[PDB]
């Protein structure tokens, strides 16, 4: 997470794909972001220290592999929001907080 | 390396006799531990003139030289037989533990108290790779403050040698998986109690310290029936109570007798938890000296007595005159069963031998009709005879 003045790096555990004996609980990108940054959730808004880090209020940057995985997975579900993808062990998500917002 | 150097440090700043004891322990811990378990049940001269005695003392006096300042968690393996589980949980080659055997071990160690004794080697961590895992049962205990724990080195590892003088209460057991094998992990607690195993000097000292002011607050009739109970009438009172009096033969004066001797015990209860002893004969367990079952050198006899009495609740209708000394006396040297009762706090009873003039030495009396639950039955060898010790407890 890159606020503009300081950054915060986090590692969040994810389940291995081809493994039946991997019992790591499976969470979404929104839940992972809420857990990794201690964000507060009022109703539908996710807040860092004083900054809204909602999916619409920031810029999500990925690498080619993560962008691919997210693109393919968005096609198979309603409510096509990136904060509902399943965080498959190798994503490289970068939230960027915009300098000017309305 | 810190604990290594600390253990090697403690093992130099101690007596040379203690070094000799501990070094003998490093190889022959088997018979040393058996002796520390079964030493208290011999004669006085038998205990003192025994060769393995003194070094025990020495190593014992080493343990008490290193007390801990806060409760410490320790782990050690234990055989299920130590907790009156007379069958196998799982073969040492098997990997899984059945639900049935688990539930059985649960229901057989639910709310019992198992008194411990002797030396024990423990560790401060859960056993992992390379550690010796002999039994499928792992005990995780919490030793309290001021508990002697001597660290030592068996030339390759570090162990903690302690001496256990308490009773264990298993609370919860769980299935664990270590390195591909299933084990049972049990949580235990310490239930301390007063004990004077062989040094009956401390015993009767505390006894006449606490119950010297006992008899001087009694009515002359109750003191009279107490002292003619002491001086021979006890046999008649016992065979009157076990003769089914209050339902078959109502005897008014003997009922007054027994109610006055019973009320003469509920005036100043036992102030703490006591470990009391009593040798007894076969006539109380439906047996006699001429029966073949009394020959406890038979494995089948020990097994049948266990199956018939272990885990049961005996009920004694008469008064149970008992002793606070594990040492063998000549007045009852022929008896082979040793009942080891645990008496809780605020219990009815009294140490009647505080007033001199009694044949029974260091003798305590408690109310008649109080049941005893037998938690464990084990055995030892006095010379050539095999005598049984019965870890029991007062169940009110």
């Amino acid at each position: 997470l890159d606020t503009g003045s300081q950054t915060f790096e986090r590692r969040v555990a994810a389940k291995e794909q081809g493994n039946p004996e991997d019992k790591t609980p499976e969470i979404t990108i929104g839940e992972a972001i809420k857990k990794a940054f201690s964000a507060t959730k009022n109703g539908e808004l996710l807040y860092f220290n004083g900054i809204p880090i909602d999916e619409s209020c920031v810029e999500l940057i990925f690498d080619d592999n993560t962008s691919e995985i997210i693109k393919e997975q968005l096609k198979y579900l309603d409510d096509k929001k990136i904060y509902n993808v399943k965080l498959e062990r190798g994503m490289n998500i970068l939230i960027k907080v915009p300098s000017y917002f309305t | 390396q810190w604990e290594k150097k600390e253990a090697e440090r403690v093992e130099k700043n101690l007596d040379t006799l203690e070094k000799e004891a501990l070094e003998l322990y490093k190889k022959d811990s088997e018979q040393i531990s058996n002796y520390s378990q079964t030493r208290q049940y011999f004669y006085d001269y038998q205990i003192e003139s025994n060769p393995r005695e003194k070094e025990y003392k020495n190593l014992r006096n080493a343990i008490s030289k290193n007390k801990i300042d806060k409760p410490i968690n320790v782990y050690y393996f234990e055989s299920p037989e130590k907790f009156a589980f007379n069958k196998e949980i799982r073969t040492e080659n098997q990997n899984e533990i059945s639900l049935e055997k688990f539930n059985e071990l649960k229901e057989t160690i639910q709310d019992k108290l198992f008194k411990q004794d002797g030396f024990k080697d423990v560790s401060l961590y859960e056993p992992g790779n390379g550690d010796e895992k002999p039994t499928p049962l792992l005990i995780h205990l919490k030793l309290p403050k001021n508990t002697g724990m001597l660290p030592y080195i068996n030339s390759n590892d570090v162990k903690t040698l302690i001496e256990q003088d308490y009773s264990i209460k298993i609370d919860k057991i769980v299935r664990i998986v270590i390195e591909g094998k299933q084990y049972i992990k049990a949580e235990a607690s310490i239930v301390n109690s007063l004990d004077f195993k062989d040094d009956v000097s401390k015993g009767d000292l505390w006894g006449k310290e606490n119950y010297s002011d006992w008899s001087n607050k009694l009515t002359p009739n109750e003191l009279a029936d107490v002292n003619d109970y002491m001086r021979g009438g006890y046999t008649a009172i016992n065979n009157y109570l076990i003769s089914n009096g209050p339902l078959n033969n109502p005897n008014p004066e003997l009922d007054s007798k027994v109610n006055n001797i019973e009320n003469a015990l509920k005036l100043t209860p036992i102030p703490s938890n006591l470990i009391v002893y009593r040798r007894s004969g076969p006539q109380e367990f439906g047996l006699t000296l001429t029966s073949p079952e009394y020959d406890f050198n038979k494995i089948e006899n020990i097994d049948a007595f266990k199956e018939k009495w272990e885990g049961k609740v005996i009920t004694y209708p008469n008064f149970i005159s008992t002793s606070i000394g594990s040492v063998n006396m000549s007045a009852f040297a022929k008896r082979k069963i040793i009942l080891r009762i645990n008496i809780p706090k605020d219990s009815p009873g009294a140490y009647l031998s505080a007033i001199p003039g009694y044949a029974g030495e260091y003798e305590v009396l408690l109310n008649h009709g109080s049941k005893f639950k037998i938690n464990k039955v084990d055995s030892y060898k006095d010379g050539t005879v095999t005598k049984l010790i019965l870890d029991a407890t007062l169940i009110n």
């Binding site: 019992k23 609980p25 | 859960e126 919860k172 769980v174 664990i176 998986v177 270590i178």
Partner: protein
């Protein structure tokens, strides 16, 4: 029926269904005590 495969003081069902910590012992997650401030944890029971 209680069961701790990985031996980390949290039962299997609690790890795979949700738990929290109260007085240093893991307790099963009731949805009630979310307003007291407690959080719901999930983990690998293996």
């Amino acid at each position: 029926e209680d069961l701790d495969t990985d031996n980390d003081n949290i039962p299997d069902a609690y790890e795979k269904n949700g738990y929290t910590i109260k007085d240093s012992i893991a307790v099963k997650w009731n949805d009630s005590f979310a307003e007291q401030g407690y959080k719901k944890y999930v983990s690998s029971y293996l």
